[PDB]
Amino acid sequence: LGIPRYRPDKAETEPQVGTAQGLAWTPVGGTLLTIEVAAVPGSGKLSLTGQLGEVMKESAQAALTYLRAHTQDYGLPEDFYNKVDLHVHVPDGATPKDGPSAGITMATAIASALSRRPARMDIAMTGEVSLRGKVMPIGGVKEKLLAAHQAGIHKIVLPKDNEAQLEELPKEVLEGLEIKLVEDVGEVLEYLLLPEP
Amino acid sequence: LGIPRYRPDKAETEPQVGTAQGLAWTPVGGTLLTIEVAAVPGSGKLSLTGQLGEVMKESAQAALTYLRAHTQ
Amino acid sequence: LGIPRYRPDKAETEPQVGTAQGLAWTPVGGTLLTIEVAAVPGSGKLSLTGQLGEVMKESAQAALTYLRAHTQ
């Protein structure tokens, strides 16, 4: 053949401070959306980057204010939203799936960049947030799971609101992929971000 | 069929700490509005951000006046 | 031949302050898009000049985000 351009797993990618490989309903093929953002201790100012829209802004603010409600959970300083330069990028357009289907992905990415703490790859995730952070069931988690095994990713974060559909998931998928089981966002951020400490 | 999508209904759907469902005849014409609180211990402010026209701002401010009048 | 239509060598072409050698692959030939930006005290508004599109502006802000990480 030629020279390898990809990796057997994204542990070779060596977990990055920006994003952990947010799964996607990318219709040409479920990407691992490294929805990277801007963050440094500083002013505190929200904006957009990367041809984004406001659905993504309201989900970003909803996650960011869950973090504001869960400041003590992730090592965030007593004021961080009004102390960090917020400039949010999405690689794939405004949103590949219309709606913030990958909402907990940039929730984690925001939390990661605010904490300056790498969110680990070889574990990918998907899910929507309320601003209370009750993780609503996104539509068809089989998509993001099939994408996750298509990138070799085996641990997947999914809601207790989607543990209902977790057992409907196909057999080859069910044992190739175990599924991390969450109901809220604090345990997403403790499953995925074990390298937050 | 597939599994139950929503949880068992609101006689036993546990009462939410924050979200008050409410009535609205939007383009869907019938829903339950989900209303948050960004209760961060911080500066202390109020803005009705999110997809809100100013008449919703007025209604919230108006019964908000009742709440601030009946706060204790 | 005649008068040399270009320089004798691109080994020295007066290294300027703000010249950025653009190694694009154009349709007809391979060019050096020697684009320029000049620094000035201003207002923070990133000026979308010189026919910028959708990804160029956010690439510029991607640059300034990295620069904001690495101002020193």
CSV table of N, CA, C and O in Angstrom, one decimal, chain A residues 80-170:
chain,number,residue,atom,x,y,z
A,80,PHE,N,-15.0,32.0,36.4
A,80,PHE,CA,-14.3,31.5,35.2
A,80,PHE,C,-15.0,32.0,33.9
A,80,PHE,O,-14.2,32.2,33.0
A,81,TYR,N,-16.3,32.0,33.9
A,81,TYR,CA,-17.0,32.4,32.7
A,81,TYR,C,-16.7,33.9,32.4
A,81,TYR,O,-16.6,34.3,31.3
A,82,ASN,N,-16.7,34.7,33.5
A,82,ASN,CA,-16.3,36.1,33.4
A,82,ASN,C,-14.8,36.3,33.7
A,82,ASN,O,-14.4,37.3,34.2
A,83,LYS,N,-14.0,35.2,33.3
A,83,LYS,CA,-12.5,35.3,33.5
A,83,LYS,C,-11.8,34.6,32.3
A,83,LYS,O,-10.6,34.4,32.4
A,84,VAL,N,-12.5,34.1,31.3
A,84,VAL,CA,-11.9,33.4,30.2
A,84,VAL,C,-12.4,33.8,28.8
A,84,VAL,O,-13.6,33.9,28.7
A,85,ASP,N,-11.5,34.0,27.9
A,85,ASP,CA,-11.8,34.4,26.5
A,85,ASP,C,-12.5,33.2,25.7
A,85,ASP,O,-11.8,32.3,25.3
A,86,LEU,N,-13.8,33.3,25.4
A,86,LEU,CA,-14.6,32.2,24.9
A,86,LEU,C,-14.8,32.5,23.4
A,86,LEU,O,-15.5,33.4,23.0
A,87,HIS,N,-14.2,31.6,22.5
A,87,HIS,CA,-14.3,31.7,21.1
A,87,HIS,C,-14.5,30.3,20.6
A,87,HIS,O,-13.5,29.5,20.6
A,88,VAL,N,-15.7,30.0,20.2
A,88,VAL,CA,-16.0,28.6,20.0
A,88,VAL,C,-16.0,28.2,18.5
A,88,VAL,O,-16.6,28.9,17.7
A,89,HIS,N,-15.2,27.2,18.2
A,89,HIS,CA,-15.1,26.7,16.8
A,89,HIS,C,-15.8,25.3,16.7
A,89,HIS,O,-15.6,24.4,17.5
A,90,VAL,N,-16.4,25.1,15.6
A,90,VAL,CA,-16.8,23.8,15.1
A,90,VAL,C,-16.2,23.5,13.7
A,90,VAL,O,-16.3,24.4,12.8
A,91,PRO,N,-15.5,22.4,13.5
A,91,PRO,CA,-14.9,22.1,12.3
A,91,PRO,C,-15.9,21.9,11.1
A,91,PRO,O,-15.7,22.5,10.0
A,92,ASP,N,-17.0,21.2,11.4
A,92,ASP,CA,-17.9,20.8,10.3
A,92,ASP,C,-19.0,21.8,10.3
A,92,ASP,O,-20.0,21.6,11.0
A,93,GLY,N,-18.9,22.8,9.5
A,93,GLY,CA,-20.0,23.8,9.2
A,93,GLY,C,-20.5,24.5,10.5
A,93,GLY,O,-19.7,24.9,11.4
A,94,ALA,N,-21.8,24.8,10.5
A,94,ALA,CA,-22.5,25.2,11.7
A,94,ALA,C,-22.8,24.0,12.6
A,94,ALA,O,-22.3,23.9,13.7
A,95,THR,N,-23.5,23.0,12.0
A,95,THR,CA,-23.7,21.7,12.7
A,95,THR,C,-24.1,20.7,11.6
A,95,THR,O,-24.8,21.0,10.7
A,96,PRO,N,-23.4,19.5,11.6
A,96,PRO,CA,-23.7,18.5,10.6
A,96,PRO,C,-25.2,18.0,10.8
A,96,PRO,O,-25.9,17.9,9.9
A,97,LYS,N,-25.5,17.7,12.1
A,97,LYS,CA,-26.9,17.4,12.4
A,97,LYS,C,-27.5,18.7,12.9
A,97,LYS,O,-26.9,19.3,13.9
A,98,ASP,N,-28.5,19.2,12.3
A,98,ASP,CA,-29.2,20.4,12.8
A,98,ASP,C,-29.8,20.2,14.2
A,98,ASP,O,-30.6,19.2,14.4
A,99,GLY,N,-29.3,21.0,15.1
A,99,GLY,CA,-29.5,20.7,16.5
A,99,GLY,C,-28.3,20.3,17.2
A,99,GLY,O,-27.3,19.8,16.6
A,100,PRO,N,-28.2,20.5,18.5
A,100,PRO,CA,-26.9,20.4,19.2
A,100,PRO,C,-26.7,18.9,19.7
A,100,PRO,O,-26.5,18.7,20.9
A,101,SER,N,-26.8,18.0,18.7
A,101,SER,CA,-26.7,16.6,19.0
A,101,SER,C,-25.4,16.2,19.7
A,101,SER,O,-25.4,15.4,20.6
A,102,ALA,N,-24.3,16.9,19.3
A,102,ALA,CA,-23.1,16.7,20.0
A,102,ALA,C,-22.9,17.8,21.1
A,102,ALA,O,-21.8,18.4,21.2
A,103,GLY,N,-23.9,17.9,21.9
A,103,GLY,CA,-23.9,19.0,22.9
A,103,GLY,C,-22.9,18.7,24.0
A,103,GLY,O,-22.2,19.6,24.5
A,104,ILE,N,-22.9,17.4,24.5
A,104,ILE,CA,-22.0,17.1,25.6
A,104,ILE,C,-20.6,17.1,25.1
A,104,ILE,O,-19.6,17.2,25.9
A,105,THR,N,-20.4,17.0,23.8
A,105,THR,CA,-19.0,17.0,23.2
A,105,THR,C,-18.4,18.4,23.4
A,105,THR,O,-17.3,18.5,23.9
A,106,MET,N,-19.1,19.4,23.0
A,106,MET,CA,-18.4,20.7,23.3
A,106,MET,C,-18.6,21.1,24.8
A,106,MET,O,-17.9,22.0,25.2
A,107,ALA,N,-19.5,20.5,25.5
A,107,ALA,CA,-19.6,20.7,27.0
A,107,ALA,C,-18.3,20.2,27.6
A,107,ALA,O,-17.6,21.0,28.3
A,108,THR,N,-17.8,19.0,27.2
A,108,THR,CA,-16.5,18.5,27.6
A,108,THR,C,-15.4,19.3,27.1
A,108,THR,O,-14.4,19.5,27.8
A,109,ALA,N,-15.5,19.8,25.9
A,109,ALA,CA,-14.4,20.5,25.2
A,109,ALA,C,-14.2,21.8,25.9
A,109,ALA,O,-13.1,22.3,26.2
A,110,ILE,N,-15.3,22.5,26.2
A,110,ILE,CA,-15.3,23.7,27.0
A,110,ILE,C,-14.7,23.5,28.4
A,110,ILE,O,-13.8,24.2,28.8
A,111,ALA,N,-15.2,22.4,29.0
A,111,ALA,CA,-14.7,22.1,30.4
A,111,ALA,C,-13.2,21.8,30.4
A,111,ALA,O,-12.5,22.1,31.3
A,112,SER,N,-12.8,21.1,29.3
A,112,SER,CA,-11.4,20.7,29.2
A,112,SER,C,-10.5,21.9,29.0
A,112,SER,O,-9.5,22.1,29.6
A,113,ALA,N,-10.9,22.8,28.1
A,113,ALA,CA,-10.1,24.0,27.8
A,113,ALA,C,-10.1,25.0,28.9
A,113,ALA,O,-9.1,25.7,29.2
A,114,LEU,N,-11.3,25.1,29.6
A,114,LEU,CA,-11.3,26.0,30.8
A,114,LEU,C,-10.4,25.4,31.9
A,114,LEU,O,-9.7,26.1,32.6
A,115,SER,N,-10.4,24.1,32.1
A,115,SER,CA,-9.6,23.5,33.1
A,115,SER,C,-8.1,23.4,32.6
A,115,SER,O,-7.3,23.1,33.5
A,116,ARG,N,-7.9,23.6,31.3
A,116,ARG,CA,-6.6,23.3,30.7
A,116,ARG,C,-6.2,21.9,30.9
A,116,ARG,O,-5.0,21.6,31.3
A,117,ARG,N,-7.2,20.9,30.8
A,117,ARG,CA,-7.0,19.6,31.2
A,117,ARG,C,-7.4,18.7,30.0
A,117,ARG,O,-8.5,18.9,29.5
A,118,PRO,N,-6.5,17.8,29.6
A,118,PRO,CA,-6.8,17.0,28.4
A,118,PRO,C,-8.0,16.0,28.7
A,118,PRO,O,-8.1,15.4,29.7
A,119,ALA,N,-8.9,16.0,27.7
A,119,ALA,CA,-10.0,15.0,27.7
A,119,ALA,C,-9.5,13.9,26.9
A,119,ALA,O,-9.1,14.1,25.7
A,120,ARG,N,-9.6,12.7,27.4
A,120,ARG,CA,-8.8,11.6,26.8
A,120,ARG,C,-9.6,11.0,25.6
A,120,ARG,O,-10.8,10.8,25.5
A,121,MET,N,-8.8,10.8,24.5
A,121,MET,CA,-9.3,10.1,23.4
A,121,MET,C,-9.2,8.6,23.6
A,121,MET,O,-8.8,8.2,24.7
A,122,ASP,N,-9.6,7.8,22.6
A,122,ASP,CA,-9.9,6.3,22.7
A,122,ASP,C,-11.3,6.1,23.4
A,122,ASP,O,-11.7,5.0,23.6
A,123,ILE,N,-11.9,7.2,23.9
A,123,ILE,CA,-13.2,7.2,24.5
A,123,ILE,C,-13.9,8.4,23.9
A,123,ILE,O,-13.5,9.6,24.1
A,124,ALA,N,-15.0,8.1,23.1
A,124,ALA,CA,-15.8,9.2,22.4
A,124,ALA,C,-17.2,9.3,23.0
A,124,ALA,O,-17.6,8.4,23.8
A,125,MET,N,-17.8,10.4,22.7
A,125,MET,CA,-19.1,10.6,23.3
A,125,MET,C,-20.1,11.4,22.4
A,125,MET,O,-19.7,12.0,21.4
A,126,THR,N,-21.3,11.4,22.9
A,126,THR,CA,-22.4,12.2,22.2
A,126,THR,C,-23.6,12.3,23.2
A,126,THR,O,-23.8,11.5,24.1
A,127,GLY,N,-24.3,13.4,23.0
A,127,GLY,CA,-25.5,13.7,23.9
A,127,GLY,C,-25.8,15.2,24.0
A,127,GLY,O,-24.9,16.1,23.8
A,128,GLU,N,-27.1,15.5,24.2
A,128,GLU,CA,-27.6,16.9,24.4
A,128,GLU,C,-27.7,17.3,25.8
A,128,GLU,O,-27.9,16.5,26.7
A,129,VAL,N,-27.7,18.6,26.1
A,129,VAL,CA,-27.9,19.1,27.4
A,129,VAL,C,-29.1,19.9,27.5
A,129,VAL,O,-29.5,20.6,26.6
A,130,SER,N,-29.8,19.8,28.7
A,130,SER,CA,-30.6,20.9,29.2
A,130,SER,C,-29.7,21.8,29.9
A,130,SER,O,-28.5,21.6,30.1
A,131,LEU,N,-30.2,23.0,30.4
A,131,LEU,CA,-29.3,23.8,31.2
A,131,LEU,C,-29.2,23.3,32.6
A,131,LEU,O,-28.2,23.6,33.3
A,132,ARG,N,-30.3,22.6,33.1
A,132,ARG,CA,-30.1,21.8,34.3
A,132,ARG,C,-29.2,20.6,34.0
A,132,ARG,O,-28.8,20.0,35.0
A,133,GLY,N,-28.8,20.3,32.8
A,133,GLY,CA,-27.9,19.3,32.5
A,133,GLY,C,-28.5,17.9,32.6
A,133,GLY,O,-27.8,16.9,32.6
A,134,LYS,N,-29.8,17.8,32.6
A,134,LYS,CA,-30.5,16.5,32.4
A,134,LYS,C,-30.3,16.2,31.0
A,134,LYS,O,-30.6,16.9,30.1
A,135,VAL,N,-29.5,15.1,30.7
A,135,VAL,CA,-29.0,14.8,29.4
A,135,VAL,C,-30.2,14.2,28.6
A,135,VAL,O,-30.4,13.0,28.7
A,136,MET,N,-30.8,15.0,27.8
A,136,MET,CA,-32.0,14.5,27.0
A,136,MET,C,-31.5,13.4,26.0
A,136,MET,O,-30.4,13.4,25.6
A,137,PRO,N,-32.4,12.5,25.6
A,137,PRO,CA,-32.1,11.5,24.6
A,137,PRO,C,-31.9,12.1,23.2
A,137,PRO,O,-32.9,12.6,22.7
A,138,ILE,N,-30.7,12.0,22.7
A,138,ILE,CA,-30.5,12.4,21.3
A,138,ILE,C,-31.1,11.3,20.4
A,138,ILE,O,-31.3,10.2,20.8
A,139,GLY,N,-31.3,11.7,19.1
A,139,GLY,CA,-32.0,10.8,18.2
A,139,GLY,C,-31.0,9.8,17.5
A,139,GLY,O,-30.2,10.2,16.7
A,140,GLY,N,-31.2,8.6,17.9
A,140,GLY,CA,-30.4,7.5,17.2
A,140,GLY,C,-29.0,7.5,17.7
A,140,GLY,O,-28.1,8.0,16.9
A,141,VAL,N,-28.7,7.1,18.9
A,141,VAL,CA,-27.3,7.0,19.3
A,141,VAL,C,-26.5,5.9,18.6
A,141,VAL,O,-25.3,5.8,18.7
A,142,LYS,N,-27.2,5.0,17.9
A,142,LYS,CA,-26.6,4.0,17.1
A,142,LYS,C,-25.7,4.6,16.0
A,142,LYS,O,-24.7,4.0,15.7
A,143,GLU,N,-26.1,5.8,15.5
A,143,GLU,CA,-25.2,6.5,14.6
A,143,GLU,C,-23.9,6.8,15.1
A,143,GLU,O,-22.8,6.5,14.5
A,144,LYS,N,-23.8,7.4,16.3
A,144,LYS,CA,-22.6,7.9,16.9
A,144,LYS,C,-21.8,6.7,17.4
A,144,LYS,O,-20.6,6.7,17.3
A,145,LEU,N,-22.5,5.6,17.8
A,145,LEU,CA,-21.8,4.4,18.2
A,145,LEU,C,-21.2,3.7,17.0
A,145,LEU,O,-20.0,3.2,17.1
A,146,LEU,N,-21.9,3.6,15.9
A,146,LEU,CA,-21.3,3.0,14.7
A,146,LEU,C,-20.2,3.8,14.1
A,146,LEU,O,-19.2,3.2,13.7
A,147,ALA,N,-20.2,5.1,14.2
A,147,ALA,CA,-19.1,5.9,13.9
A,147,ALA,C,-17.9,5.7,14.9
A,147,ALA,O,-16.8,5.7,14.5
A,148,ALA,N,-18.2,5.5,16.2
A,148,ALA,CA,-17.2,5.3,17.2
A,148,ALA,C,-16.4,4.0,17.0
A,148,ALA,O,-15.2,4.0,17.1
A,149,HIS,N,-17.1,2.9,16.6
A,149,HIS,CA,-16.4,1.7,16.3
A,149,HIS,C,-15.7,1.9,14.9
A,149,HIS,O,-14.7,1.2,14.7
A,150,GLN,N,-16.3,2.7,14.0
A,150,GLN,CA,-15.6,3.0,12.8
A,150,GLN,C,-14.3,3.8,12.9
A,150,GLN,O,-13.5,3.7,12.0
A,151,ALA,N,-14.1,4.4,14.0
A,151,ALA,CA,-12.9,5.0,14.4
A,151,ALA,C,-12.1,4.2,15.4
A,151,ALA,O,-11.1,4.7,16.0
A,152,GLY,N,-12.6,3.0,15.6
A,152,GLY,CA,-11.9,2.1,16.6
A,152,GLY,C,-12.1,2.5,18.0
A,152,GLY,O,-11.5,1.9,18.9
A,153,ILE,N,-13.0,3.4,18.3
A,153,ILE,CA,-13.2,3.9,19.7
A,153,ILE,C,-14.2,3.0,20.3
A,153,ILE,O,-15.3,2.7,19.7
A,154,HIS,N,-13.9,2.5,21.5
A,154,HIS,CA,-14.7,1.4,22.1
A,154,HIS,C,-15.5,1.8,23.4
A,154,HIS,O,-16.5,1.2,23.7
A,155,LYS,N,-15.1,2.8,24.1
A,155,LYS,CA,-15.8,3.3,25.2
A,155,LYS,C,-16.6,4.6,24.8
A,155,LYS,O,-16.1,5.5,24.3
A,156,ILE,N,-17.9,4.5,25.0
A,156,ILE,CA,-18.9,5.5,24.6
A,156,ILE,C,-19.7,6.0,25.7
A,156,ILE,O,-20.2,5.2,26.5
A,157,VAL,N,-19.8,7.3,25.9
A,157,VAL,CA,-20.6,8.0,26.9
A,157,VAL,C,-22.0,8.2,26.3
A,157,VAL,O,-22.2,8.8,25.3
A,158,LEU,N,-23.0,7.7,27.0
A,158,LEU,CA,-24.4,7.8,26.6
A,158,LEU,C,-25.4,7.9,27.8
A,158,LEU,O,-25.1,7.3,28.9
A,159,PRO,N,-26.5,8.5,27.6
A,159,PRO,CA,-27.4,8.8,28.8
A,159,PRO,C,-28.1,7.6,29.4
A,159,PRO,O,-28.3,6.6,28.7
A,160,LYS,N,-28.5,7.8,30.6
A,160,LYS,CA,-29.5,6.9,31.2
A,160,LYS,C,-30.9,7.2,30.6
A,160,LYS,O,-31.7,6.3,30.5
A,161,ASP,N,-31.1,8.4,30.0
A,161,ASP,CA,-32.2,8.5,29.1
A,161,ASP,C,-32.1,7.7,27.8
A,161,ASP,O,-33.1,7.3,27.2
A,162,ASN,N,-30.8,7.4,27.4
A,162,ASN,CA,-30.6,6.5,26.3
A,162,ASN,C,-30.2,5.1,26.8
A,162,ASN,O,-29.9,4.3,25.9
A,163,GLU,N,-30.2,4.7,28.1
A,163,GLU,CA,-30.0,3.3,28.4
A,163,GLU,C,-31.2,2.5,27.9
A,163,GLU,O,-31.1,1.3,27.9
A,164,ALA,N,-32.4,3.2,27.7
A,164,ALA,CA,-33.5,2.6,27.2
A,164,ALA,C,-33.2,2.0,25.8
A,164,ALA,O,-33.6,0.8,25.5
A,165,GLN,N,-32.5,2.7,25.0
A,165,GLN,CA,-32.2,2.3,23.6
A,165,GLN,C,-30.8,1.7,23.5
A,165,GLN,O,-30.4,1.2,22.5
A,166,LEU,N,-30.1,1.6,24.7
A,166,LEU,CA,-28.8,1.0,24.7
A,166,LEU,C,-28.9,-0.5,24.5
A,166,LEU,O,-28.0,-1.2,24.0
A,167,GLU,N,-30.0,-1.1,24.9
A,167,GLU,CA,-30.1,-2.6,24.7
A,167,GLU,C,-30.7,-3.0,23.4
A,167,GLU,O,-30.6,-4.1,22.9
A,168,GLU,N,-31.4,-2.0,22.7
A,168,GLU,CA,-31.8,-2.2,21.4
A,168,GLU,C,-30.7,-2.2,20.4
A,168,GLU,O,-30.8,-2.7,19.2
A,169,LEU,N,-29.5,-1.7,20.8
A,169,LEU,CA,-28.3,-1.6,20.0
A,169,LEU,C,-27.8,-2.9,19.5
A,169,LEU,O,-28.0,-3.9,20.2
A,170,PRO,N,-27.3,-3.0,18.2
A,170,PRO,CA,-26.9,-4.4,17.7
A,170,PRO,C,-25.8,-5.1,18.4
A,170,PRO,O,-25.0,-4.5,19.1
